[PDB]
Structures are given as C-alpha cells and as structure tokens.
Amino acid sequence: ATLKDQLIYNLLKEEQTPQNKITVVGVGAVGMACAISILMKDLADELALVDVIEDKLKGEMMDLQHGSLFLRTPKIVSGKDYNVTANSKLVIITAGARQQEGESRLNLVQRNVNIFKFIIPNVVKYSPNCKLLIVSNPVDILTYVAWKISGFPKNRVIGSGCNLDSARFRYLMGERLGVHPLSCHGWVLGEHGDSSVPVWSGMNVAGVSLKTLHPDLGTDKDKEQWKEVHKQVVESAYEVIKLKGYTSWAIGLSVADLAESIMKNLRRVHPVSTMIKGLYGIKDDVFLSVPCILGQNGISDLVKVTLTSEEEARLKKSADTLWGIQKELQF
Amino acid sequence: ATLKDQLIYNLLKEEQTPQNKITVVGVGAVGMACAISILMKDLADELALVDVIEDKLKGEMMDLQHGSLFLRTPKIVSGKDYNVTANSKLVIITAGARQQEGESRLNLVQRNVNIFKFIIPNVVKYSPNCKLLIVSNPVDILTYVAWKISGFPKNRVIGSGCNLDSARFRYLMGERLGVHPLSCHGWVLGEHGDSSVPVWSGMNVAGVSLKTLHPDLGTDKDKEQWKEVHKQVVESAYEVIKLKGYTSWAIGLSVADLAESIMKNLRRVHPVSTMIKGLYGIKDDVFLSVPCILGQNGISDLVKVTLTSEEEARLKKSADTLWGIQKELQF
Amino acid sequence: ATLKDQLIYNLLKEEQTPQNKITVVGVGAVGMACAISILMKDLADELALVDVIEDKLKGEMMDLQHGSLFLRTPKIVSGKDYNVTANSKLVIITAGARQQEGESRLNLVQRNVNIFKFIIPNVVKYSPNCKLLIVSNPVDILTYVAWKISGFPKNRVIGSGCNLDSARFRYLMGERLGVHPLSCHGWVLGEHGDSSVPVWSGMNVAGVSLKTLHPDLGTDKDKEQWKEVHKQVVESAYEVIKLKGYTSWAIGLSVADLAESIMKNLRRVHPVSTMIKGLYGIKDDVFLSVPCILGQNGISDLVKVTLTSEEEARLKKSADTLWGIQKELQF
Amino acid sequence: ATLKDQLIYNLLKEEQTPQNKITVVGVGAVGMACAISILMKDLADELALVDVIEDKLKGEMMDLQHGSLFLRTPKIVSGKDYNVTANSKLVIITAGARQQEGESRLNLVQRNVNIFKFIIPNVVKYSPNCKLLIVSNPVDILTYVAWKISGFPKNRVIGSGCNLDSARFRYLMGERLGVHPLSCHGWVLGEHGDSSVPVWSGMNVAGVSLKTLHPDLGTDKDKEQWKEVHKQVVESAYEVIKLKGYTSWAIGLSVADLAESIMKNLRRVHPVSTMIKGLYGIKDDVFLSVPCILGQNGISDLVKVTLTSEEEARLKKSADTLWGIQKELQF
Ligand SMILES: NC(=O)C1=CN([C@@H]2O[C@H](COP(=O)(O)OP(=O)(O)OC[C@H]3O[C@@H](n4cnc5c(N)ncnc54)[C@H](O)[C@@H]3O)[C@@H](O)[C@H]2O)C=CC1
Ligand SMILES: NC(=O)C1=CN([C@@H]2O[C@H](COP(=O)(O)OP(=O)(O)OC[C@H]3O[C@@H](n4cnc5c(N)ncnc54)[C@H](O)[C@@H]3O)[C@@H](O)[C@H]2O)C=CC1
Ligand SMILES: NC(=O)C1=CN([C@@H]2O[C@H](COP(=O)(O)OP(=O)(O)OC[C@H]3O[C@@H](n4cnc5c(N)ncnc54)[C@H](O)[C@@H]3O)[C@@H](O)[C@H]2O)C=CC1
Ligand SMILES: NC(=O)C1=CN([C@@H]2O[C@H](COP(=O)(O)OP(=O)(O)OC[C@H]3O[C@@H](n4cnc5c(N)ncnc54)[C@H](O)[C@@H]3O)[C@@H](O)[C@H]2O)C=CC1
C-alpha cells in the first residue's frame, strides 16, 4: 500500500479527456513566446508541444513544467508524434525557416510549403475539428496553403496576418500622441509584409478622424510625415531581426491575443489572414488581412472596410503580388 | 499648429517619476524571461533593461515595445547607461556567464564576481532605495557579493535561491500524487545547487505529514525511494541545460513570483537566500535559502524551520561548502 | 440592405453552443457575489442567471450586461425557465429562503428542500452532465438533498462546505502571525459552521507544525488561546450577519475558487462537502467537508486526514445529527 | 517566548507606509461593487473603507477580510474617522442619496452637496496629494463641488461621468451588430444624465464610420432607428432601478476601469467629468464628460472631439442646465 493510497482515497480511476487544449508545433523563438504568453493568460487546460528536434522539445517542455506551480495550466505534453495533439481546440503553427537580415518573408515560401505538407495532414488527423492559426512566414500564403492541404472550411484556417502590424502601428501612433495604444485606433491591412496597407481614413482617437483634422495625413505632402509611421511598421521587423537576430515577444503576445478571442468566443475584431476572394475586385483565392470577427468557430464574419481609390489599389496590388506566388506553388 | 494640438488640449506639464519601476539587468535568456513574466503580471508601470551588448538590448527593448497594445506597462526603456535605471523599486540582476553541460554553478563565481564589481555600484547609485533581486549564478554567493558591494541592509538584498528548487520539488511531488503543485507542500532549503536540503519533516498534503504516514520517506530504506525526487530536483537544471542549452522559463516565473510578493507587499513566505549567520550554529556570513517573509521592504522576517538532526547536518554542510568560497573572495 | 449587412459580411450560418457555461441559481446577495467573482475571473464563456423573482432577475442580469465592456464573458443570460441553463458545465445553487438572522441551519431545512425539489430536476433536465455546487444552507444537508433528487454520482455533487471556514481560518491565522493567508496553512473540516473541526495538527507555516512548536495549541490551557482563532471562525460569521444583515463577498470569492479548480481541471485540494460514508467510522449517507481534489469531473479523489479520536468523535457526532434530520425530510 | 517568536525571526521593526492605497467613501451598493472590482483587479496594496453607519461599515470590512486568501490586497481597513484614509493615492466618493424610481439624478444635488461639505475637507486633510474620483449623483455637479471645496487643481478631481454611459452604448451597439463591445466604438458625452450627447460621427467598427455608411444614423428619418440606442442608454439606469432597486455592478466595473488607468498611469482615454470652460463656447465653471487622458496625475489632457453643429448645440444645452443648478448653488 503506497504512501499515496494511504493518503488519497480515489473515487474514480483512469478517466480523462481534454476540454480547452492548445497545441503549438515549432518550439523555436516564436513557438515558445506563444506558449509562455498563452500559459500566463490562462487560455488552455492542456498545452501540447511538437517539433522535430527531440531534445530541444523535451527541454522546452521540462522548463515549462518546472514553473507549473506559478501557472493554471495543469497538463503540458510534448513529442514528435502528433498523437500528443489529439483533440486540440486550437493549433498554432510556428515551425519553419525564419528570415535572414534583409530577407523578404516571401523568400521562405518554398522551404516552409515543403514542411507544411507533413505538418498540416498530421495536425488534422488528431484534431479534425480544430481551428488552425498560422504564424510561419510568409503567413498570408501559408494560411492559403494550410487551407488547401487540410480541407478545412476557411473559417477554421486563420493567419497571424496584420494583428502584429496594426499593434505596431498603434504603438507608434500612441508614441507620437502621448496616448496609450489601447486608446489609439488605426488599421494596417493586406499582406503581413512589405505591401501592407495603412487605412488612413479610419485612423482616429476617441472617434475623431485624424485624416479629417489633418488632411495631408498619409501623403507625401504631409508636413508631419505620418507616412513614416507605416514605414516604420514595415521596416520594424527588419530592424528587430538586424538588432537581435529574430522577432519573438510581440508576435507571441499577438498570437495570445488571437487565441484569447478564439478560446473565449469573444467575437472581437482583428485583422487576420483570410480568403478575401470577392471583395475589392479580387477574383482569386488570395489570402490577406482584413478585420475579421474571431470566436469559437474561427472567422465567422469579415468587416467590409470602405477604402479610398488609392487604398483599394494598394490592397489589390498586394493581392497581385501574393497570388503570383500562390499561382506556381507546388504541393 | 500640429495635428497633436488640434486633437489634444494639454493641462499638465512634465510631472513624471515612476511609482512601481522594475529594472532587469542583462537581456539574455533569463533576463528576458523575467521581463515577459513581469509584464504579463502587471507588476510594473515602468520596466527598464540594461546590457553591455547595445545591439541585443535595443532589439529586445523594441520587441517588447511592439507588444505594448497587449500589456499594461506604459513605459519600456533600455540603455547601456544605468541612468535609465533611476528610481527602480526592484532591480533584477541576471547578467553573467551561465553553466555549460555538467559545469557546477560554483565554477562561475570568479567570472561573475567580476561582472558584479561593475554592475552593483552602478545599480545602487541610481536606485539607493531599491530591493536587489539576484539571479546570476552561483546565486547564494552573488547575493553575499552583492550585499558586500552595495552597502545595503540585508533585508534589501535577495537571492532567487531555492524558490525555483521548491517549485520543482512541488511539481514532482504533485506528479507522483496526482495533485496540483499548489496543493503539494515541501521545502528545498540551503544552496540553490548540488547541496540543497529537502525538509522531509514538513512535506505534507492538506496538512498531513507524509513523513508520519511513511517513516521511511526520504531514506535509503524507503521502498518508494522518495529521496529520488530531491535527486531529480538537484539533477534537473543539468538535464534541461543538456537538452536545450540553458534554462529560462521556470526561473522567469520564479522571479515574477518573488517580484509579485515584493511589489505588492504580500508578506508571503518564500525560500530565498539571505544572511543566516546566527541560525543553526553557523557563525560566518553565509547566504543561503531559508523561508522568508517577502514584502515592500524585501526580507522582513525569517521562519526558523524546525530541522531534524540530519537535515541540520546537511544544511550546516551546505553552508561550509558555500563559506569555503566566500572567505577566499577578493573584491 | 441593413447597416449591419453593409458593414459586415457573414460566413458562418447558425453556429454556436456554449463551451464553458456556468449557471447561478438564486440572485440574492450570495448568488450575485458568486456571479461577479466568476465574471471577473474569466471562468465562463456564458453565464446564466435564474430565480423566481422575475423583476430582480432581469435587473441584475441587465446590470451585469451594462458592464460587458470590462469583461471577457460574451454572453450573459437569465430567465425563470431553465432552458437558459442548457449545457452548463457547472451549476451553482444559492437559492433558498435565506436562513434567519439568528437560528442555525435546520428548523427551515424542509422549506429549502421543497425549493430543491423544483430546482434540481429542471437543472438536471437541461444539463444532465454538469457538476452541481451547492451553497444553500444548511449546505451539508442540502448537498445530500441535491444528490438524492439529482441522481448524480457523488463525484458531481459538491457542497461549498468548509472552503470558506478554512479561508476564514487562514485569514485569522495570518493576522496573528503577520503572514499572508496564502502562506498560512490550516484546515477546518466537517460541518460548515457551528460544529466545524479545526485540525490543529495541520496548522503550519512553511512546513513547521505549530502544534509541535506549541503543544498547548487548541487546548483550553493555551496561554496564547489559539482555540479562540476557531471560535472566531464560527462567531465572525454571526458577527457579519448581525452587522450587515448577511454575508456575501467572502462566500462569493470562495465559490469562484472552487469554480476555478473545477472549470480548469486544476486538481487542487479544497475542503468541500462530499459523501463521506465509509470514512472515520461513518455508516450513513452523509456529506461533510473533507479535503477533496477538484477537477473537470468534480471530486475525483479525497485526502484521508489522520484525525485524533477526539476529532473523529466530532465528525461522527455531526454525521449522527445530520442523518437524523435527513430521514425526517420529505422529498 | 511566544509561538510567533519561536516561529518567526524578525529582521525589520519600523516598517510601514502604503504605496498604492485606495479609499472608498460610502459602503453602499455602489461602494462595495467598487471595492470588490478594485480588489479583484489587484489595483491596491491597501484598501480603506469609510461610512457613517458603523455597523454596516464593520461588517463589510470583515466580509471582505474573510476573502483575503483569494485576493492580493494584504490590508483592508475601515473607520468612521478619516485617519484610516491617510496617504491614499486615490479616494472614491460614493456616499449619498440615490434616486428612487423615476427620480432625476439632479434632484439629489442639495442633499448630497451637504454631505460633501463634510466628506471632502476630511478627505483633503488626510490625503492632500490624492486623486478624487467622484461617483455620487449628480456626478457632474458633485465633481465641481468636490473641486471647489478641496482646492485641488482640476486635474486631480475626476467624475466617473459618462464612462458608464459609453460602456452601455457600446454594449447596445455590439448587441445590434453581433460584435463584442471591445470592438464597438462610440462616445456619449456631456451630462451623465438625461441630457447626454451621442457623438454619432465617431461611432465605428474597425475605423469604418457608421455615419458614413448610413447617413440617416441618429436621425429621426433613420428607418433602422439607431437613435433608440441612445434613448436606451439614457433610460437604462431608470429601468434597472425600477427592476432591482438601484444600479451597482456596471458602475463598479466602470470605476475599476478608471482606477486602473489612474493607478497604473496608462494614459487611456476615458469620458469623465472635468471642467470644460472655454471649449464649445462654454464660459462657466461647468463640469461634464469629455474624452480625457487619465494617468497617475489624474486628467493630464483633454480630447477636442469635432462636434457637428447639432451635437455642439446639444452639448452646450447639456452644460447650461447643469450650470443653472450650479449657479443657484450656495456653499
Ligand atoms: N507572422 C509573424 O508575425 C511572425 C512569423 N515568424 C515566422 O515563424 C517561423 C518560425 O520563427 P522562429 O521561431 O524565430 O524560428 P526558430 O528557428 O527559432 O524555430 C523554428 C522551429 O520549427 C522547427 N521545425 C522545422 N521544421 C519543422 C517541422 N516539419 N515540423 C516541426 N517543427 C519544425 C524547428 O525545429 C524550430 O524549432 C518563421 O517562418 C518566422 O518567419 C517569426 C516572427 C513572427
Ligand atoms: N538562480 C537560478 O535559478 C538561475 C540562474 N541562471 C544564471 O543567470 C545568468 C544568465 O543566464 P542566461 O540568461 O542564460 O545567460 P545569457 O548568455 O543568455 O545572457 C547573459 C546576458 O548578460 C550580459 N552580460 C555579460 N556580462 C555583462 C556585464 N558586465 N554587464 C551587463 N551585462 C552583461 C550578456 O550580454 C547577456 O545578454 C547565469 O549566471 C545563469 O547561471 C540561469 C537559470 C536559472
Ligand atoms: N455555504 C456558505 O458558506 C453560506 C451559505 N449561505 C446561504 O445561501 C443562500 C442564499 O443566501 P442569500 O442570497 O444571502 O439570501 P437571499 O434570500 O437574498 O437569496 C435567496 C434567493 O433564492 C431565490 N429563491 C427562492 N426559491 C427559489 C426557487 N425555486 N428558484 C429560484 N430561486 C429561488 C430567492 O428568490 C433569492 O433571490 C442561503 O440559503 C444562505 O443561508 C449564505 C452565506 C454563507
Ligand atoms: N455616477 C454613476 O454612474 C453612479 C452613481 N450612483 C450614485 O452613488 C451614490 C450611492 O449609491 P448607493 O451605493 O446605491 O446608495 P446606498 O444607500 O446603497 O449607500 C450609500 C452610502 O453612503 C453613506 N453615507 C451617507 N452620508 C455619508 C457620509 N458623510 N459619509 C460617509 N458615508 C455616507 C450611506 O450611509 C450609504 O452607506 C448615489 O449618489 C448614486 O446615485 C449610483 C450608480 C452609479
């Protein structure tokens, strides 16, 4: 008779089943910043970790396990076999090649498409009803790719997209204005990358259009060069990579934000990568970022943002660049 | 008049001063895991970061700043010069060489005692009233070293100590019992390293003594071999380092735990390294982990744990091993 | 072509089903305090309220809804019909004829039983797989009553019991010691209220047994009179009732603590009311507060606390008296 | 020696001074909802309660104290004497007469102006440097009165104002739209009362002006009748009071959202009661709700919303009925 049976009288034997489980595959910098942010936001009762490097995977899992006393996620599991993934409400894909100093996120597509062909079919086998949240770059195209490979309805295949870019916009907005970013509003849409589109017309504080006040806003005739805010937004990740090697913390927070709206059916509005064929005169299966209502079934709605002539061209230009790569993708 | 003046009528001047400022020294794996845990627990209205590598520091700072939207810490600052550190309530020192595969934490002492000769005087110049939270290894020695250099009273000089070791002990205990670590109680005291002491006396669930239910507990005669749990506690950091190269997440959550007790004046009990000369017949200025009440003034009080004759022996030895290095210390 | 249709493009048809729904029955001071505490702990994606007073019900629900902007609970609903309760994971019963300002918790049992005979089968009808958390006094008797009417297995019928008495115990302990109740350990078990049992043997700080350090602990000879800490555990409840009319905040936080372990499957140990037949010499179907492991299936396990004969006599005296009332009841 | 001495070795004696202390004056329905919200958001290390009913005051203090275990505010005190208020960082004034069914909030001005002449000087005495957060109705006028009696700079005298009303507006707006209020944007300004102003022009989702989508918005010709949302906002408090007797939960969350911005120096923008003399052609010492930036020093900045001609008329009308009551104010 163990110390345990002398101490604990058991009322029910080996019966479980996970209720709010999250999986992250890829325990690199992004994957672990997603994990830690999701754990400290109390979003999962189970967190499963997958990667192809078996020792780093076990070490990252053990490290998190050792801080369980400070957490409210009672089960953390890992392995190279996707059976540890079974019955995930949400699966976050951060595995892949990240970019070099100066490297376009688009240049990583074939290398990442090549590992999505193994990851995506396996994620679906053990979690057929999950929402798929793609973070690996180029995020817009790999969401499209994950949607094609999985067979999932498009509402359940979501891309990181421009939640981060818009967060960066709002941080820079608040910096200029001496206001917290929560009370600074402005949206960066389209490709999470060089061709992203700032929607100047919807930029506002407490409901007052900055464009209306300051008509030159977002143009080259602008004496204050607010165009430079969206420039910093584009260039920010290149700067961070150059400075520290890679970005991780912000995207982890960004992904935790999306997880939270999904895991908790909040029906909040985020700009995420979704299939936009049909709007602004795009006739192809292009994925890019528009504001979407996120909840327990993924994307249930899209906000039809009205754009100026020029904004619409910029957004279609972004879709043209994107679809060109999608066209000759092979998988 | 700028777009900002049309938007915002200003009433107030320049009145700053941080009220709940925390500084982290060193933005490596451990420093940044501390930063992220403190930001997600809202312990601070201002976080400052310092490191000798300007590069890395600016990039970590920016990465954090890009996530401000998802946080409630309105100022993240950094710099090579410790004037960004001014008026911190809590300075967390994580700078320094870490251990290689198999290397003892004690083998780092001279390398990091050298780093501390530059860091500590700079820290105290700009925050004379701060609490010092030492993380760099060997944490027991460097807390002594940091107290000798600073001139601070012992209550404001704190080593992270055995808070992590106990969190690891509780975790494995709960792993054996099927109970959450929050409800499994056991203390690992002394050196945060190979000579730590597990207090079988006060190992309990719901207030029932495990030792009493099982007098062989923590004994070579023990058929359940519980002392293996403490062996896994000693061995765990080495195993994590062997698996992933370092450790970060659990110590980051362990620091935030201690920061929270300190920042919120909770007077919770933690096993932290402090000056224990006077207790258990230790007549030298040895620092090591004993249970302490932590609040707005650092360590205000000590819990005089009742020790077996043997546990007292192992702890008195843990001291001797530690004082062995302390006496031969030059700075 | 509504504004909504202009602004939003829909993707998902009917959709929905609450995933982590909680129901509170009874919206007096207690039921509403549970409600606000669960809401502020982000415990449910849907909160349902039910009572017989339709006016107060709609108004309490509306008051909560007007605060939705500051919450992370997207659906708040209420009704006299239990259809609003469908698919609750947890249902908290606070309804009653609130036990008179003075008399214990017995002369009115049957009146509350008649209320349960209406409430319980409606609850079970729309959420046959829920856990049931009973707060109504007398909690130990009415938890038994909910078990009889519901037909639920015992693991799924949990009385609030002595979680709150113990919480009061650890507050009073920490006030004496100058330590946060979080780090003050001690258990009050048995009948919630007048006959509750303070297990002096488990009272410890940081693993140090206060009874062993201080043998007079719990005796009437005790020059420090630690007996009085438990007397105040009982009488302070009366004092608050006498002072403000009733209690609410403390019990509300307690219930949300239990809800937290349950909804998040933490497997923390709490002293709640469970069918205790087969332990400490008790042979009648009775519920008493025992340390219990709470998780997604309710009470899965139970800690068998070593008790003195003296202590054990009180539990069986309490079990004797409870079962006596129970066989006179009509239901 | 005592058991406390045998257990705890004391290092520091001297210790005292709260750093993030909050006082609530008035422990009625509102005040308690305020305290409990503040407690569960961990905004304070010291909470002080004040009232004139010594029984109700003590029982609420104790009821809160019994939940200490579940909280992170280690000091909860109360007294009829204001020395317990000493050195509060924020004082929240909720005492006074509330409105019976149908009663206008302005009809409480004389009774409550009398109560302030007692409270405010006592408060100012013991916390000369504190922020004053006024909730007592009529909140706009009583904020003026508090400011007059106190002699504080106008940045440190804030009325809860239309934070609650705008929250209600965004709840109703989201309800019609199928979107969380966090993502629904709209401002109700001016008097917290019958004459509040909805700024239709800034109502938006993801920066899409709804007035531009639906130019009949807010107009009587609007055949979707959106101006019924503002009517509901005006009437909501009358309906809730008719239904449950009073409002408490939503205002407590509103006050907690304001306290958070203040105690954490977030510089979020909230619509609160401030002095608007000189704006929108208002030449008197009128206090009503405009978008303010809230932080550690109270209101540091004001947002100049572009009001349409009708909207500007409505706002000056709202100010002139406020002034006619202020004008006739003897004190
Ligand atoms: N959408 C956004 O805003 C962000 C996108 N990213 C992208 O995330 C991806 C990963 O970034 P990092 O974490 O910094 O790289 P990393 O090199 O630190 O980690 C990537 C991990 O993926 C694992 N991996 C490679 N192939 C795998 C496969 N078939 N299956 C499972 N795991 C596999 C690797 O072992 C590695 O641990 C990159 O594409 C990066 O560009 C990075 C920053 C944020
Ligand atoms: N007490 C505990 O439980 C644990 C302590 N540690 C110790 O923390 C320390 C750091 O570990 P890691 O973050 O992984 O190392 P790391 O290599 O990732 O980062 C160390 C940082 O310190 C900086 N550094 C070196 N000399 C400096 C100097 N004079 N001034 C300012 N910065 C300087 C470095 O630039 C680097 O950014 C080590 O001593 C490690 O042993 C690590 C894990 C747990
Ligand atoms: N377990 C514990 O630690 C404590 C238990 N309690 C008990 O909780 C219960 C509630 O206490 P209070 O809210 O303060 O009293 P209360 O009388 O204000 O609330 C009881 C509510 O249940 C409603 N009710 C009566 N019959 C109902 C029925 N068929 N269906 C739905 N609702 C019905 C009533 O309308 C009332 O709103 C009482 O029995 C009290 O003795 C109170 C505090 C401590
Ligand atoms: N601005 C807003 O949105 C909100 C404003 N209110 C207002 O809050 C105020 C109170 O509402 P309730 O709490 O429901 O009323 P209540 O009657 O439940 O409690 C009011 C408390 O103020 C106490 N009091 C009277 N004179 C006092 C004095 N010199 N010093 C200290 N305490 C004193 C009373 O004893 C009572 O405890 C009213 O003016 C109400 O209209 C109510 C809801 C929200």
Numbering used by the authors:
A (entry chain B), B (entry chain A), C (entry chain C), D (entry chain D): 1 to 331
Please share excerpts from the published article on this structure.
Lactate dehydrogenase (LDH) is a tetrameric enzyme composed of four subunits. The 1,4-dihydronicotinamide adenine dinucleotide (NADH)-dependent enzyme LDHA mediates a redox reaction for the reduction of pyruvate to lactate at the end of glycolysis when the cytosolic NADH/nicotinamide adenine dinucleotide (NAD+) ratio is high, which is a crucial step for regenerating NAD+, and is needed to maintain glycolysis for the survival of cancer cells. Full-length LDHA is composed of 331 amino acids and includes a nucleotide binding region (residues 28–56).
The LDHA structure with NADH and malonate was solved at a 2.4 Å resolution, and the LDHA tetramer occurred in space group P21. Each NADH binds to a monomer of the LDHA tetramer in about α6 and α10 helices. Negatively charged NADH and malonate substrates were in the tunnel-type groove inside the positively charged surface. The NADH adenosine and pyrophosphate unit were located at the opening of the tunnel cavity. The NADH nicotinamide moiety and malonate were within closed cavities, and they interacted with each other. The active-site loop near NADH and malonate was in an active closed conformation. The structures of LDHA with malonate and NADH were shown in an active closed conformation, whereas LDHA with inhibitor-MA showed in an inactive open conformation.
